[PDB]
Each structure stands twice: as C-alpha cells, then as structure tokens.
Amino acid sequence: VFLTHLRANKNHVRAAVRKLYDIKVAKVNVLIRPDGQKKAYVRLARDYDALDIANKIGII
C-alpha cells in the first residue's frame, strides 16, 4: 500500500520505488479514497519478500 501526492500517474510509482528501494513493480494499482487521498497498490516481484521490505524499512 502507499499514500501519495495527488498527481501519481502510476509510473512515477514505477519510477520512484525502484529509485528509492530498487524494487521491481509488477502491477501498479490506484484508487482514490474520497477523503482526498490516493491510496496506492503495487505488487512485488518474486525475489522480493514483502515482510523483508518493511522490516528493512522499519514498518512493522
């Protein structure tokens, strides 16, 4: 999941996460929660483990 600025053109996330974490995207999904926030959805690659991602970052 991700929460982003309001012009996320679905490839900036494809640009940024590999720029910030070297993470291969799989399918970048987007919805806008109607309180004014663009909740994001991205899928990992196979070698990257999701529990290894945030534990590297610090999100429990």
Binding site: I32, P34, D35, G36
Partner: protein, 50 residues
Amino acid sequence: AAHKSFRIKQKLAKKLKQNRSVPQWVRLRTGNTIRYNAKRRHWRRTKLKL
C-alpha cells in the same frame, strides 16, 4: 451517485473533512468561545448544493 466527477470527488472531501466536531482539547485556549461547531453537518437536516 457513482458517476461523480473530479470536482465533486474533491469537493466532497472538503464537505467531509469538515464534519468532525471541535478539536478535542482546544477549548483550553485563552478565551475559549467554541462549544460545538457552527458548520456541523448531519445530512437530512442540512443540504449541500453549492
């Protein structure tokens, strides 16, 4: 519903994020005049239309 537009999705957050009550400590300012809100929306005693 369900076929809104990108004003009335962003307009409808502002007439949603303004629907809290008072901040739940700020009646301990100096000169507290704020009991509960002026703009306070229910949705059958108050309409939107603007």
